[PDB]
């Protein structure tokens, strides 16, 4: 005995994976290659551990 009218609007939005790209993957690979540089340090030095 009581019916109401609905008009739905589905707004569909997609994110732009650019601002979150650099801010995420770049520092990770940076510290990664810095660690790779860190392997070149001889175990005898001792500064490798602190590295």
């Amino acid at each position: 005995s009581n019916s109401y009218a609905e008009m739905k609007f589905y707004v569909i939005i997609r994110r732009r994976p650019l601002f979150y790209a650099v801010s995420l993957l770049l520092p990770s690979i940076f510290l990664m290659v810095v660690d790779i540089v860190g392997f070149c340090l001889p175990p005898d030095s001792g500064e490798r551990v602190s590295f």
Partner: peptide, 30 residues
Amino acid sequence: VRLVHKQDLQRPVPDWLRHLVLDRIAWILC
């Protein structure tokens, strides 16, 4: 720092001894 260290191994190769301690030394001195 990998180059200069006491690891009780090896000897300086003459081929790269002349290239660095002789030639590059004169090149750097000037």
